[PDB]
From Swiss-Prot:
Organ and tissue specificity: Highly expressed in estrogen receptor positive breast tumors and in osteosarcoma tumors.
Subunit structure: Interacts with ESR1 and NCOA3 and these interactions are enhanced by estradiol. Interacts with acetylated lysine residues on histone H1.4, H2A, H2B and H3 (in vitro).
UniProt-recorded name of the protein: ATPase family AAA domain-containing protein 2
Induction: Up-regulated in breast, uterus, colon, ovary, and stomach tumors. Induced in breast cancer cells overexpressing NCOA3 or treated with estrogen. Down-regulated in 5-fluorouracil-resistant derivatives of the colon cancer cell line HCT 116.
Length: 130
């Protein structure tokens, strides 16, 4: 309907704002763009699907997220990837794993405080009717 196009445009607005707020945080710089293959030449082999906050914006714009839940899958992907690709005790790995977890925790916390559950529920129901 028209009532439904609006619902997803509002979602896209919501998600772009949250994503922007993560992307401007200095701790998450490492997650903002796709990996530089010169810096980590084996990344593509170790990680099935790279994900990053730039890509998440592109996906929002491509109407790829119909629910916040689907969005959070990709935030969770950004984080799990980092935990997978940098597992070691060394401080460089610990630092990025911390930041990965902090990204994930921040996203969820913004969403907890700012997403209306009835809005998310409406998004899920319009989605389920397709
Ligand atoms: C500028 C840039 C562009 N593209 C990719 C990266 C990048 C580099 C290194 C790692 N992982 C390292 C694996 C081994 C070797 C050292 C250490 N363990 C680890 C470096 C950790 C470092 C990352 C940059 S920081 O400023 O956040 C401080 C901690 C990378 N690992 C990744 O998972 C990603 C997404 C990129 C990346 C950087």
């Amino acid at each position: 309907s028209m009532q439904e196009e609006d619902t997803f445009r509002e979602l896209r607005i919501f998600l772009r704002n949250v994503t922007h707020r993560l992307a401007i945080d200095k701790r998450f710089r490492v997650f903002t763009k796709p990996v530089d293959p010169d810096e980590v030449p084996d990344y593509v082999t170790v990680i099935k699907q790279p994900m990053d906050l730039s890509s998440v914006i592109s996906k929002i714009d491509l109407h790829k997220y119909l629910t916040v839940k689907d969005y959070l899958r990709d935030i969770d992907l950004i984080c799990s990837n980092a935990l997978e690709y940098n597992p070691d005790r060394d401080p460089g790995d610990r630092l990025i794993r911390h930041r990965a977890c902090a990204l994930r925790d921040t996203a969820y916390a913004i969403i907890k405080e700012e997403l209306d559950e009835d809005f998310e529920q409406l998004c899920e129901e319009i989605q389920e009717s397709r």
